[PDB]
Amino acid sequence: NYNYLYRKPFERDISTPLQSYG
């Protein structure tokens, strides 16, 4: 599956440039 992806405490940012699984 290719849908899952990745690149302060409990910080989040979805802006993008990104890596992914297979």
Next chain:
Amino acid sequence: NCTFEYVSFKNLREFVFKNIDGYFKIYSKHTPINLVRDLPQGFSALEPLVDLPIGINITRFQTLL
């Protein structure tokens, strides 16, 4: 996008806004006042109201009217 939502001179309204570990905290107080110029030289603390796990990187703000 759109990842979170929540719902709930003569007067001085006071606030403090702070972010710690992605939790955003709001304190408040309302009071009457008698001095016309600006913030009166006295003492009155603010209680907490709201404490939200927003997780955003806040660096700027603006006010609405």
